[PDB]
PDB file of all heavy atoms in Angstrom:
ATOM      1  N   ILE A   1      22.355   3.536 -15.550  1.00  0.00           N
ATOM      2  CA  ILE A   1      21.221   4.484 -15.405  1.00  0.00           C
ATOM      3  C   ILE A   1      20.028   3.753 -14.913  1.00  0.00           C
ATOM      4  O   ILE A   1      19.740   2.658 -15.394  1.00  0.00           O
ATOM      5  CB  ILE A   1      20.940   5.149 -16.735  1.00  0.00           C
ATOM      6  CG1 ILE A   1      22.217   6.024 -17.103  1.00  0.00           C
ATOM      7  CG2 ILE A   1      19.700   6.071 -16.657  1.00  0.00           C
ATOM      8  CD1 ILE A   1      22.224   6.561 -18.526  1.00  0.00           C
ATOM      9  N   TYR A   2      19.437   4.227 -13.772  1.00  0.00           N
ATOM     10  CA  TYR A   2      18.331   3.508 -12.990  1.00  0.00           C
ATOM     11  C   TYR A   2      17.032   4.409 -13.130  1.00  0.00           C
ATOM     12  O   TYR A   2      17.099   5.672 -13.007  1.00  0.00           O
ATOM     13  CB  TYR A   2      18.746   3.335 -11.492  1.00  0.00           C
ATOM     14  CG  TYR A   2      18.109   2.170 -10.726  1.00  0.00           C
ATOM     15  CD1 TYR A   2      18.516   1.902  -9.388  1.00  0.00           C
ATOM     16  CD2 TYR A   2      17.156   1.312 -11.258  1.00  0.00           C
ATOM     17  CE1 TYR A   2      17.953   0.832  -8.695  1.00  0.00           C
ATOM     18  CE2 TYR A   2      16.618   0.226 -10.558  1.00  0.00           C
ATOM     19  CZ  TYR A   2      16.985   0.031  -9.255  1.00  0.00           C
ATOM     20  OH  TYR A   2      16.463  -1.150  -8.677  1.00  0.00           O
ATOM     21  N   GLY A   3      15.892   3.839 -13.460  1.00  0.00           N
ATOM     22  CA  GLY A   3      14.624   4.435 -13.326  1.00  0.00           C
ATOM     23  C   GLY A   3      14.002   4.068 -12.061  1.00  0.00           C
ATOM     24  O   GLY A   3      13.090   3.208 -12.097  1.00  0.00           O
ATOM     25  N   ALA A   4      14.254   4.788 -11.039  1.00  0.00           N
ATOM     26  CA  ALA A   4      13.814   4.523  -9.646  1.00  0.00           C
ATOM     27  C   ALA A   4      12.768   5.371  -9.111  1.00  0.00           C
ATOM     28  O   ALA A   4      12.540   6.563  -9.445  1.00  0.00           O
ATOM     29  CB  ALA A   4      15.014   4.435  -8.668  1.00  0.00           C
ATOM     30  N   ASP A   5      12.021   4.831  -8.175  1.00  0.00           N
ATOM     31  CA  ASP A   5      11.137   5.570  -7.375  1.00  0.00           C
ATOM     32  C   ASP A   5      10.038   6.306  -8.196  1.00  0.00           C
ATOM     33  O   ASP A   5       9.725   7.487  -7.993  1.00  0.00           O
ATOM     34  CB  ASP A   5      11.859   6.673  -6.539  1.00  0.00           C
ATOM     35  CG  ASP A   5      12.766   6.096  -5.453  1.00  0.00           C
ATOM     36  OD1 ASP A   5      12.351   5.167  -4.749  1.00  0.00           O
ATOM     37  OD2 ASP A   5      13.829   6.750  -5.291  1.00  0.00           O
ATOM     38  N   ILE A   6       9.401   5.585  -9.100  1.00  0.00           N
ATOM     39  CA  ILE A   6       8.354   6.096  -9.978  1.00  0.00           C
ATOM     40  C   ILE A   6       6.995   5.739  -9.378  1.00  0.00           C
ATOM     41  O   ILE A   6       6.627   4.529  -9.308  1.00  0.00           O
ATOM     42  CB  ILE A   6       8.467   5.501 -11.400  1.00  0.00           C
ATOM     43  CG1 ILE A   6       9.779   5.953 -12.019  1.00  0.00           C
ATOM     44  CG2 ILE A   6       7.249   5.881 -12.248  1.00  0.00           C
ATOM     45  CD1 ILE A   6      10.168   5.116 -13.089  1.00  0.00           C
ATOM     46  N   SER A   7       6.124   6.656  -8.911  1.00  0.00           N
ATOM     47  CA  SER A   7       4.876   6.302  -8.295  1.00  0.00           C
ATOM     48  C   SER A   7       4.011   5.622  -9.338  1.00  0.00           C
ATOM     49  O   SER A   7       3.838   6.106 -10.487  1.00  0.00           O
ATOM     50  CB  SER A   7       4.108   7.526  -7.687  1.00  0.00           C
ATOM     51  OG  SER A   7       4.835   8.018  -6.597  1.00  0.00           O
ATOM     52  N   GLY A   8       3.468   4.444  -9.026  1.00  0.00           N
ATOM     53  CA  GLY A   8       2.586   3.744  -9.856  1.00  0.00           C
ATOM     54  C   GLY A   8       2.572   2.228  -9.574  1.00  0.00           C
ATOM     55  O   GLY A   8       3.237   1.785  -8.625  1.00  0.00           O
ATOM     56  N   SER A   9       1.784   1.514 -10.351  1.00  0.00           N
ATOM     57  CA  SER A   9       1.601   0.043 -10.126  1.00  0.00           C
ATOM     58  C   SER A   9       1.411  -0.680 -11.443  1.00  0.00           C
ATOM     59  O   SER A   9       0.774  -0.152 -12.341  1.00  0.00           O
ATOM     60  CB  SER A   9       0.439  -0.283  -9.189  1.00  0.00           C
ATOM     61  OG  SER A   9       0.343  -1.678  -8.859  1.00  0.00           O
ATOM     62  N   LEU A  10       1.900  -1.899 -11.503  1.00  0.00           N
ATOM     63  CA  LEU A  10       1.652  -2.839 -12.630  1.00  0.00           C
ATOM     64  C   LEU A  10       0.774  -3.964 -12.281  1.00  0.00           C
ATOM     65  O   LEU A  10       0.552  -4.863 -13.115  1.00  0.00           O
ATOM     66  CB  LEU A  10       2.971  -3.287 -13.319  1.00  0.00           C
ATOM     67  CG  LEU A  10       3.721  -2.259 -14.061  1.00  0.00           C
ATOM     68  CD1 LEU A  10       5.049  -2.801 -14.523  1.00  0.00           C
ATOM     69  CD2 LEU A  10       2.978  -1.697 -15.204  1.00  0.00           C
ATOM     70  N   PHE A  11       0.211  -4.029 -11.065  1.00  0.00           N
ATOM     71  CA  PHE A  11      -0.767  -5.099 -10.738  1.00  0.00           C
ATOM     72  C   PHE A  11      -2.078  -4.779 -11.401  1.00  0.00           C
ATOM     73  O   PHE A  11      -2.589  -3.641 -11.318  1.00  0.00           O
ATOM     74  CB  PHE A  11      -0.935  -5.228  -9.246  1.00  0.00           C
ATOM     75  CG  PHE A  11       0.249  -5.893  -8.578  1.00  0.00           C
ATOM     76  CD1 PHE A  11       1.356  -5.192  -8.124  1.00  0.00           C
ATOM     77  CD2 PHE A  11       0.303  -7.235  -8.403  1.00  0.00           C
ATOM     78  CE1 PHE A  11       2.428  -5.814  -7.602  1.00  0.00           C
ATOM     79  CE2 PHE A  11       1.385  -7.891  -7.854  1.00  0.00           C
ATOM     80  CZ  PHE A  11       2.449  -7.149  -7.419  1.00  0.00           C
ATOM     81  N   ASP A  12      -2.707  -5.805 -11.923  1.00  0.00           N
ATOM     82  CA  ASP A  12      -4.095  -5.606 -12.478  1.00  0.00           C
ATOM     83  C   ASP A  12      -5.002  -5.380 -11.301  1.00  0.00           C
ATOM     84  O   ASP A  12      -4.915  -6.016 -10.249  1.00  0.00           O
ATOM     85  CB  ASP A  12      -4.409  -6.919 -13.261  1.00  0.00           C
ATOM     86  CG  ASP A  12      -5.807  -6.922 -13.953  1.00  0.00           C
ATOM     87  OD1 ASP A  12      -6.831  -6.562 -13.391  1.00  0.00           O
ATOM     88  OD2 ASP A  12      -5.807  -7.406 -15.101  1.00  0.00           O
ATOM     89  N   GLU A  13      -6.022  -4.480 -11.513  1.00  0.00           N
ATOM     90  CA  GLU A  13      -6.983  -4.233 -10.451  1.00  0.00           C
ATOM     91  C   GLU A  13      -7.761  -5.439 -10.044  1.00  0.00           C
ATOM     92  O   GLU A  13      -8.189  -5.515  -8.885  1.00  0.00           O
ATOM     93  CB  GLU A  13      -7.923  -3.044 -10.814  1.00  0.00           C
ATOM     94  CG  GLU A  13      -8.903  -3.336 -11.894  1.00  0.00           C
ATOM     95  CD  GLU A  13      -9.845  -2.118 -12.204  1.00  0.00           C
ATOM     96  OE1 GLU A  13      -9.739  -0.929 -11.657  1.00  0.00           O
ATOM     97  OE2 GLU A  13     -10.715  -2.387 -13.035  1.00  0.00           O
ATOM     98  N   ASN A  14      -7.878  -6.431 -10.912  1.00  0.00           N
ATOM     99  CA  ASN A  14      -8.607  -7.630 -10.554  1.00  0.00           C
ATOM    100  C   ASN A  14      -7.768  -8.681  -9.814  1.00  0.00           C
ATOM    101  O   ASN A  14      -8.258  -9.749  -9.426  1.00  0.00           O
ATOM    102  CB  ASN A  14      -9.249  -8.243 -11.786  1.00  0.00           C
ATOM    103  CG  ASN A  14     -10.300  -7.293 -12.416  1.00  0.00           C
ATOM    104  OD1 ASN A  14     -11.126  -6.681 -11.723  1.00  0.00           O
ATOM    105  ND2 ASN A  14     -10.145  -7.060 -13.695  1.00  0.00           N
ATOM    106  N   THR A  15      -6.439  -8.445  -9.677  1.00  0.00           N
ATOM    107  CA  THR A  15      -5.618  -9.369  -8.859  1.00  0.00           C
ATOM    108  C   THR A  15      -5.866  -9.090  -7.371  1.00  0.00           C
ATOM    109  O   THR A  15      -5.577  -7.960  -6.901  1.00  0.00           O
ATOM    110  CB  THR A  15      -4.113  -9.104  -9.198  1.00  0.00           C
ATOM    111  OG1 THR A  15      -3.924  -9.385 -10.560  1.00  0.00           O
ATOM    112  CG2 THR A  15      -3.198  -9.985  -8.305  1.00  0.00           C
ATOM    113  N   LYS A  16      -6.516 -10.044  -6.703  1.00  0.00           N
ATOM    114  CA  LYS A  16      -6.906  -9.799  -5.353  1.00  0.00           C
ATOM    115  C   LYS A  16      -5.923 -10.191  -4.290  1.00  0.00           C
ATOM    116  O   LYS A  16      -6.059  -9.735  -3.169  1.00  0.00           O
ATOM    117  CB  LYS A  16      -8.247 -10.524  -5.065  1.00  0.00           C
ATOM    118  CG  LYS A  16      -9.425 -10.113  -5.997  1.00  0.00           C
ATOM    119  CD  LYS A  16      -9.630  -8.590  -6.078  1.00  0.00           C
ATOM    120  CE  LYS A  16     -10.820  -8.175  -6.992  1.00  0.00           C
ATOM    121  NZ  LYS A  16     -10.764  -6.707  -7.296  1.00  0.00           N
ATOM    122  N   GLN A  17      -4.980 -11.031  -4.609  1.00  0.00           N
ATOM    123  CA  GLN A  17      -4.010 -11.602  -3.658  1.00  0.00           C
ATOM    124  C   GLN A  17      -2.639 -10.910  -3.896  1.00  0.00           C
ATOM    125  O   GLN A  17      -2.190 -10.842  -5.038  1.00  0.00           O
ATOM    126  CB  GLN A  17      -3.819 -13.096  -3.817  1.00  0.00           C
ATOM    127  CG  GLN A  17      -5.133 -13.973  -3.639  1.00  0.00           C
ATOM    128  CD  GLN A  17      -4.892 -15.419  -4.065  1.00  0.00           C
ATOM    129  OE1 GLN A  17      -4.327 -15.642  -5.121  1.00  0.00           O
ATOM    130  NE2 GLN A  17      -5.357 -16.423  -3.247  1.00  0.00           N
ATOM    131  N   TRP A  18      -2.073 -10.419  -2.801  1.00  0.00           N
ATOM    132  CA  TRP A  18      -0.693  -9.840  -2.837  1.00  0.00           C
ATOM    133  C   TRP A  18      -0.559  -8.763  -3.882  1.00  0.00           C
ATOM    134  O   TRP A  18       0.479  -8.646  -4.535  1.00  0.00           O
ATOM    135  CB  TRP A  18       0.335 -10.984  -2.932  1.00  0.00           C
ATOM    136  CG  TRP A  18       0.482 -11.769  -1.676  1.00  0.00           C
ATOM    137  CD1 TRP A  18      -0.495 -12.419  -0.994  1.00  0.00           C
ATOM    138  CD2 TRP A  18       1.725 -12.000  -0.929  1.00  0.00           C
ATOM    139  NE1 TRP A  18       0.039 -13.037   0.159  1.00  0.00           N
ATOM    140  CE2 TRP A  18       1.393 -12.790   0.235  1.00  0.00           C
ATOM    141  CE3 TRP A  18       3.069 -11.667  -1.141  1.00  0.00           C
ATOM    142  CZ2 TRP A  18       2.351 -13.184   1.133  1.00  0.00           C
ATOM    143  CZ3 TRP A  18       4.009 -12.069  -0.218  1.00  0.00           C
ATOM    144  CH2 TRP A  18       3.632 -12.785   0.927  1.00  0.00           C
ATOM    145  N   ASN A  19      -1.589  -7.917  -4.012  1.00  0.00           N
ATOM    146  CA  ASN A  19      -1.600  -6.807  -4.889  1.00  0.00           C
ATOM    147  C   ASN A  19      -0.999  -5.636  -4.115  1.00  0.00           C
ATOM    148  O   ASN A  19      -1.595  -5.145  -3.172  1.00  0.00           O
ATOM    149  CB  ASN A  19      -3.015  -6.479  -5.301  1.00  0.00           C
ATOM    150  CG  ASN A  19      -3.099  -5.332  -6.324  1.00  0.00           C
ATOM    151  OD1 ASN A  19      -2.348  -4.361  -6.255  1.00  0.00           O
ATOM    152  ND2 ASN A  19      -4.013  -5.437  -7.294  1.00  0.00           N
ATOM    153  N   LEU A  20       0.195  -5.189  -4.477  1.00  0.00           N
ATOM    154  CA  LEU A  20       0.929  -4.176  -3.657  1.00  0.00           C
ATOM    155  C   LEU A  20       0.270  -2.819  -3.674  1.00  0.00           C
ATOM    156  O   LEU A  20       0.664  -1.991  -2.826  1.00  0.00           O
ATOM    157  CB  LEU A  20       2.412  -4.065  -4.135  1.00  0.00           C
ATOM    158  CG  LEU A  20       3.166  -5.435  -3.981  1.00  0.00           C
ATOM    159  CD1 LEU A  20       4.675  -5.156  -4.266  1.00  0.00           C
ATOM    160  CD2 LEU A  20       2.949  -6.158  -2.715  1.00  0.00           C
ATOM    161  N   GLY A  21      -0.705  -2.584  -4.516  1.00  0.00           N
ATOM    162  CA  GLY A  21      -1.486  -1.310  -4.456  1.00  0.00           C
ATOM    163  C   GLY A  21      -2.727  -1.440  -3.608  1.00  0.00           C
ATOM    164  O   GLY A  21      -3.445  -0.406  -3.461  1.00  0.00           O
ATOM    165  N   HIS A  22      -3.002  -2.578  -3.016  1.00  0.00           N
ATOM    166  CA  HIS A  22      -4.248  -2.793  -2.223  1.00  0.00           C
ATOM    167  C   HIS A  22      -3.941  -3.266  -0.847  1.00  0.00           C
ATOM    168  O   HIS A  22      -4.780  -3.923  -0.186  1.00  0.00           O
ATOM    169  CB  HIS A  22      -5.190  -3.801  -2.934  1.00  0.00           C
ATOM    170  CG  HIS A  22      -5.704  -3.378  -4.240  1.00  0.00           C
ATOM    171  ND1 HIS A  22      -6.355  -4.258  -5.096  1.00  0.00           N
ATOM    172  CD2 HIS A  22      -5.711  -2.178  -4.866  1.00  0.00           C
ATOM    173  CE1 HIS A  22      -6.733  -3.612  -6.181  1.00  0.00           C
ATOM    174  NE2 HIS A  22      -6.373  -2.345  -6.062  1.00  0.00           N
ATOM    175  N   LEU A  23      -2.760  -3.059  -0.276  1.00  0.00           N
ATOM    176  CA  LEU A  23      -2.440  -3.424   1.030  1.00  0.00           C
ATOM    177  C   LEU A  23      -3.080  -2.458   2.119  1.00  0.00           C
ATOM    178  O   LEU A  23      -3.290  -1.345   1.785  1.00  0.00           O
ATOM    179  CB  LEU A  23      -0.902  -3.481   1.316  1.00  0.00           C
ATOM    180  CG  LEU A  23      -0.086  -4.440   0.405  1.00  0.00           C
ATOM    181  CD1 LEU A  23       1.362  -4.330   0.794  1.00  0.00           C
ATOM    182  CD2 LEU A  23      -0.565  -5.892   0.411  1.00  0.00           C
ATOM    183  N   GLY A  24      -3.210  -2.961   3.300  1.00  0.00           N
ATOM    184  CA  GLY A  24      -3.569  -2.102   4.456  1.00  0.00           C
ATOM    185  C   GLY A  24      -2.513  -1.027   4.624  1.00  0.00           C
ATOM    186  O   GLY A  24      -1.250  -1.325   4.481  1.00  0.00           O
ATOM    187  N   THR A  25      -2.895   0.228   4.863  1.00  0.00           N
ATOM    188  CA  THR A  25      -1.980   1.310   4.923  1.00  0.00           C
ATOM    189  C   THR A  25      -1.268   1.385   6.348  1.00  0.00           C
ATOM    190  O   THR A  25      -1.764   0.927   7.347  1.00  0.00           O
ATOM    191  CB  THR A  25      -2.599   2.710   4.700  1.00  0.00           C
ATOM    192  OG1 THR A  25      -3.445   2.993   5.804  1.00  0.00           O
ATOM    193  CG2 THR A  25      -3.564   2.691   3.431  1.00  0.00           C
ATOM    194  N   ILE A  26      -0.077   1.990   6.288  1.00  0.00           N
ATOM    195  CA  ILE A  26       0.654   2.163   7.544  1.00  0.00           C
ATOM    196  C   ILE A  26      -0.043   3.127   8.509  1.00  0.00           C
ATOM    197  O   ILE A  26      -0.018   2.947   9.712  1.00  0.00           O
ATOM    198  CB  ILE A  26       2.033   2.684   7.300  1.00  0.00           C
ATOM    199  CG1 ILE A  26       2.867   1.771   6.427  1.00  0.00           C
ATOM    200  CG2 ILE A  26       2.765   2.998   8.654  1.00  0.00           C
ATOM    201  CD1 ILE A  26       4.002   2.468   5.774  1.00  0.00           C
ATOM    202  N   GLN A  27      -0.717   4.119   7.888  1.00  0.00           N
ATOM    203  CA  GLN A  27      -1.515   5.030   8.734  1.00  0.00           C
ATOM    204  C   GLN A  27      -2.639   4.333   9.427  1.00  0.00           C
ATOM    205  O   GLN A  27      -2.927   4.575  10.618  1.00  0.00           O
ATOM    206  CB  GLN A  27      -2.040   6.231   7.919  1.00  0.00           C
ATOM    207  CG  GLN A  27      -0.996   7.080   7.341  1.00  0.00           C
ATOM    208  CD  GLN A  27      -0.253   6.558   6.083  1.00  0.00           C
ATOM    209  OE1 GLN A  27      -0.738   5.646   5.420  1.00  0.00           O
ATOM    210  NE2 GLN A  27       0.844   7.163   5.771  1.00  0.00           N
ATOM    211  N   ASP A  28      -3.329   3.379   8.810  1.00  0.00           N
ATOM    212  CA  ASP A  28      -4.363   2.644   9.403  1.00  0.00           C
ATOM    213  C   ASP A  28      -3.830   1.691  10.469  1.00  0.00           C
ATOM    214  O   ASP A  28      -4.454   1.420  11.492  1.00  0.00           O
ATOM    215  CB  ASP A  28      -5.267   1.877   8.421  1.00  0.00           C
ATOM    216  CG  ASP A  28      -6.246   2.809   7.711  1.00  0.00           C
ATOM    217  OD1 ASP A  28      -6.474   3.980   8.146  1.00  0.00           O
ATOM    218  OD2 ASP A  28      -6.788   2.360   6.676  1.00  0.00           O
ATOM    219  N   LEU A  29      -2.628   1.093  10.215  1.00  0.00           N
ATOM    220  CA  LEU A  29      -2.012   0.247  11.240  1.00  0.00           C
ATOM    221  C   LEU A  29      -1.676   1.084  12.489  1.00  0.00           C
ATOM    222  O   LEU A  29      -2.008   0.595  13.554  1.00  0.00           O
ATOM    223  CB  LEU A  29      -0.774  -0.438  10.636  1.00  0.00           C
ATOM    224  CG  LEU A  29       0.066  -1.398  11.507  1.00  0.00           C
ATOM    225  CD1 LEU A  29       0.944  -0.732  12.538  1.00  0.00           C
ATOM    226  CD2 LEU A  29      -0.864  -2.486  12.080  1.00  0.00           C
ATOM    227  N   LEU A  30      -1.036   2.241  12.272  1.00  0.00           N
ATOM    228  CA  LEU A  30      -0.750   3.074  13.498  1.00  0.00           C
ATOM    229  C   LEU A  30      -1.984   3.427  14.230  1.00  0.00           C
ATOM    230  O   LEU A  30      -2.092   3.372  15.512  1.00  0.00           O
ATOM    231  CB  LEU A  30       0.121   4.239  13.120  1.00  0.00           C
ATOM    232  CG  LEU A  30       0.600   5.209  14.215  1.00  0.00           C
ATOM    233  CD1 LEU A  30       1.902   5.858  13.789  1.00  0.00           C
ATOM    234  CD2 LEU A  30      -0.365   6.292  14.547  1.00  0.00           C
ATOM    235  N   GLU A  31      -3.072   3.745  13.514  1.00  0.00           N
ATOM    236  CA  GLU A  31      -4.332   4.052  14.155  1.00  0.00           C
ATOM    237  C   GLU A  31      -4.907   2.869  14.844  1.00  0.00           C
ATOM    238  O   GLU A  31      -5.386   2.961  16.077  1.00  0.00           O
ATOM    239  CB  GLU A  31      -5.309   4.558  13.085  1.00  0.00           C
ATOM    240  CG  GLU A  31      -6.705   4.873  13.636  1.00  0.00           C
ATOM    241  CD  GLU A  31      -7.688   5.216  12.500  1.00  0.00           C
ATOM    242  OE1 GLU A  31      -7.235   5.743  11.462  1.00  0.00           O
ATOM    243  OE2 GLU A  31      -8.874   5.010  12.823  1.00  0.00           O
ATOM    244  N   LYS A  32      -4.955   1.659  14.321  1.00  0.00           N
ATOM    245  CA  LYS A  32      -5.413   0.496  14.953  1.00  0.00           C
ATOM    246  C   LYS A  32      -4.593   0.134  16.232  1.00  0.00           C
ATOM    247  O   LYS A  32      -5.196  -0.352  17.205  1.00  0.00           O
ATOM    248  CB  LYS A  32      -5.420  -0.748  13.987  1.00  0.00           C
ATOM    249  CG  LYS A  32      -6.496  -0.657  12.918  1.00  0.00           C
ATOM    250  CD  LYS A  32      -6.531  -1.951  12.021  1.00  0.00           C
ATOM    251  CE  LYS A  32      -5.245  -2.218  11.226  1.00  0.00           C
ATOM    252  NZ  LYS A  32      -5.479  -3.264  10.156  1.00  0.00           N
ATOM    253  N   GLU A  33      -3.277   0.318  16.177  1.00  0.00           N
ATOM    254  CA  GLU A  33      -2.449  -0.054  17.343  1.00  0.00           C
ATOM    255  C   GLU A  33      -2.469   0.961  18.387  1.00  0.00           C
ATOM    256  O   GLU A  33      -2.434   0.514  19.608  1.00  0.00           O
ATOM    257  CB  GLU A  33      -1.001  -0.386  16.866  1.00  0.00           C
ATOM    258  CG  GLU A  33      -0.944  -1.587  15.912  1.00  0.00           C
ATOM    259  CD  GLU A  33      -1.449  -2.843  16.561  1.00  0.00           C
ATOM    260  OE1 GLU A  33      -0.830  -3.302  17.565  1.00  0.00           O
ATOM    261  OE2 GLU A  33      -2.487  -3.437  16.150  1.00  0.00           O
ATOM    262  N   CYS A  34      -2.427   2.205  18.063  1.00  0.00           N
ATOM    263  CA  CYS A  34      -2.128   3.272  19.041  1.00  0.00           C
ATOM    264  C   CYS A  34      -3.348   4.204  19.299  1.00  0.00           C
ATOM    265  O   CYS A  34      -3.267   5.087  20.153  1.00  0.00           O
ATOM    266  CB  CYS A  34      -0.917   4.065  18.565  1.00  0.00           C
ATOM    267  SG  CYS A  34       0.592   2.964  18.435  1.00  0.00           S
ATOM    268  N   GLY A  35      -4.370   4.148  18.440  1.00  0.00           N
ATOM    269  CA  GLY A  35      -5.595   4.918  18.583  1.00  0.00           C
ATOM    270  C   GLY A  35      -5.670   6.307  17.967  1.00  0.00           C
ATOM    271  O   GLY A  35      -6.672   6.918  18.116  1.00  0.00           O
ATOM    272  N   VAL A  36      -4.591   6.752  17.345  1.00  0.00           N
ATOM    273  CA  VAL A  36      -4.475   8.131  16.873  1.00  0.00           C
ATOM    274  C   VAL A  36      -4.637   8.157  15.312  1.00  0.00           C
ATOM    275  O   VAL A  36      -4.028   7.318  14.674  1.00  0.00           O
ATOM    276  CB  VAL A  36      -3.088   8.693  17.235  1.00  0.00           C
ATOM    277  CG1 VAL A  36      -1.982   7.850  16.675  1.00  0.00           C
ATOM    278  CG2 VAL A  36      -2.946  10.110  16.798  1.00  0.00           C
ATOM    279  N   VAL A  37      -5.534   8.891  14.768  1.00  0.00           N
ATOM    280  CA  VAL A  37      -5.720   9.066  13.375  1.00  0.00           C
ATOM    281  C   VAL A  37      -4.645  10.065  12.952  1.00  0.00           C
ATOM    282  O   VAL A  37      -4.410  11.120  13.548  1.00  0.00           O
ATOM    283  CB  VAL A  37      -7.163   9.617  12.925  1.00  0.00           C
ATOM    284  CG1 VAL A  37      -7.285   9.699  11.460  1.00  0.00           C
ATOM    285  CG2 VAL A  37      -8.288   8.756  13.515  1.00  0.00           C
ATOM    286  N   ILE A  38      -3.978   9.735  11.812  1.00  0.00           N
ATOM    287  CA  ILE A  38      -2.972  10.663  11.230  1.00  0.00           C
ATOM    288  C   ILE A  38      -3.169  10.850   9.698  1.00  0.00           C
ATOM    289  O   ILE A  38      -3.771   9.974   9.046  1.00  0.00           O
ATOM    290  CB  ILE A  38      -1.514  10.124  11.451  1.00  0.00           C
ATOM    291  CG1 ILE A  38      -1.321   8.661  10.963  1.00  0.00           C
ATOM    292  CG2 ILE A  38      -1.195  10.296  12.947  1.00  0.00           C
ATOM    293  CD1 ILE A  38       0.132   8.186  10.836  1.00  0.00           C
ATOM    294  N   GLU A  39      -2.694  11.976   9.210  1.00  0.00           N
ATOM    295  CA  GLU A  39      -2.647  12.256   7.786  1.00  0.00           C
ATOM    296  C   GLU A  39      -1.615  11.313   7.119  1.00  0.00           C
ATOM    297  O   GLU A  39      -0.766  10.703   7.805  1.00  0.00           O
ATOM    298  CB  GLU A  39      -2.293  13.701   7.516  1.00  0.00           C
ATOM    299  CG  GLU A  39      -0.902  14.182   7.770  1.00  0.00           C
ATOM    300  CD  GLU A  39      -0.368  14.286   9.212  1.00  0.00           C
ATOM    301  OE1 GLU A  39      -1.204  14.115  10.169  1.00  0.00           O
ATOM    302  OE2 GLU A  39       0.816  14.619   9.359  1.00  0.00           O
ATOM    303  N   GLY A  40      -1.691  11.285   5.797  1.00  0.00           N
ATOM    304  CA  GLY A  40      -0.704  10.557   4.953  1.00  0.00           C
ATOM    305  C   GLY A  40      -1.309   9.433   4.239  1.00  0.00           C
ATOM    306  O   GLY A  40      -2.331   8.850   4.560  1.00  0.00           O
TER     307      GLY A  40
END
């Protein structure tokens, strides 16, 4: 029995390096590369 795919984070908000809840978003990357703002 697997507990998978649960939205949330265990990184402390004060962890500034490699904090998986504070990464640059994929929507922002697509916008930076291609110029188009998207939802999500």
Side-chain angles (χ1 to χ4, degrees):
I1 295 169
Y2 206 176
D5 292 315
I6 296 160
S7 293
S9 186
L10 292 173
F11 286 89
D12 181 314
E13 71 179 5
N14 297 316
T15 298
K16 302 309 181 194
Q17 301 170 313
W18 288 57
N19 183 322
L20 299 189
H22 297 168
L23 303 178
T25 67
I26 300 159
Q27 298 76 17
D28 284 344
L29 180 285
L30 182 154
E31 178 187 330
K32 289 183 298 194
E33 298 299 297
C34 299
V36 57
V37 183
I38 53 166
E39 72 291 351

